[PDB]
Design a protein around this ligand. Structure first.
Ligand SMILES: C[C@H]1CC[C@@H]2C(C(=O)O)=C[C@H]3CC(C)(C)C[C@]213
Ligand SMILES: O=C(O)CNC(=O)C(=O)O
Ligand SMILES: [Fe+3]
Ligand SMILES: [Mg+2]
Ligand SMILES: [Mg+2]
Length: 261
């Protein structure tokens, strides 16, 4: 469980950036998004949690917690968090265009995540997290989109985020099988057996700061890391969308907001 390689030095170099991405199936970029814009999104999520998660109205972002992710009306949270305005801000688009080397289309769907620490819990609720999977298994038909994952407040090794299997995107779609320990809508979801992820596809996770981006290939095998933070005990607050060349086919998920899919 190593660390992401910082790819920010490669942004000035089309060839070098693409070569890294091709080999590894991800890019980790530090301090490339407008931190004021990110903070505004974080504070929108915070206000949603005050209104819907019974979060402390006087807590700072890092003091924030909620009793239960599940007790929060996720549909209502989408009214609070103004992600489309963020993704489509010129400063954000510029970074996306640097990554792709061409004009882009940002998905109309974004997933917002507000996961409290469950350090010390004997029966923790982590069924709302994700098993090993590839976004391309459930998004298509085109497979040239990339997932863009951003922290809204900082993450730590203990507070979690997403773990990536380095270079796991080079053998196409992998088998996803029912996993009863991960659920959406009472339905179990499908994941890649952890045994079917090679020891050679080294698992990576680094702490990230608001302003940072993690992005990865449609066939990158990745999974949630649970929040077991204690000192500091932090929420993990993040959001993820998908982005693709403006010219590429725009599928169902690309055109359909989260609340309707
Ligand atoms: C495979 C699992 C984990 C990734 C996706 C996910 C997520 O939260 O990213 C929840 C499941 C529902 C889904 C149909 C969108 C597919 C999911
Ligand atoms: O953030 C998480 O726990 C899981 N995220 C993803 O699977 C993603 O962004 O594609
Ligand atoms: Fe995913
Ligand atoms: Mg107080
Ligand atoms: Mg392939």
């Amino acid at each position: 469980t190593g660390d992401y390689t910082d790819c920010t030095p490669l942004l000035g170099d089309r060839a070098a950036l693409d070569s890294f991405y091709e080999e590894h199936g991800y890019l980790f970029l530090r301090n490339v998004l407008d931190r004021d814009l990110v903070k505004t999104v974080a504070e929108q999520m915070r206000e949603g949690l005050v209104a819907l998660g019974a979060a402390d109205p006087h807590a700072t972002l890092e003091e924030l917690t909620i009793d239960s992710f599940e007790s929060v009306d996720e549909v209502a949270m989408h009214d609070y968090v103004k992600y489309d305005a963020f993704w489509n801000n010129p400063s954000t688009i510029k970074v996306f265009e640097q990554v792709f080397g061409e004009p882009v289309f940002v998905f109309l769907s974004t997933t917002i995540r507000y996961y409290p620490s469950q350090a010390g819990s004997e029966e923790p609720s982590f069924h709302y997290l994700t098993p090993f999977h590839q976004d391309g298994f459930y998004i298509g038909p085109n497979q040239d989109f990339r997932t863009f994952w951003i922290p809204l407040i900082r993450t730590t090794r203990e507070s979690g985020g997403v773990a990536l299997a380095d270079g796991s995107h080079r053998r196409g779609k992998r088998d996803h099988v029912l996993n009863e320990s991960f659920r959406r809508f009472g339905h179990p979801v499908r994941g890649i057996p952890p045994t079917e992820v090679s020891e050679d596809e080294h698992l990576l996770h680094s702490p990230m700061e608001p302003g940072d981006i993690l992005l990865f290939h449609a066939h990158m095998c990745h999974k949630s890391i649970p929040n077991l933070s204690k000192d500091p005990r932090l929420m993990r607050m993040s959001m993820d969308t998908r982005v693709q060349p403006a010219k590429s086919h725009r599928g169902f998920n690309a055109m359909t907001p989260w609340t309707e899919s």
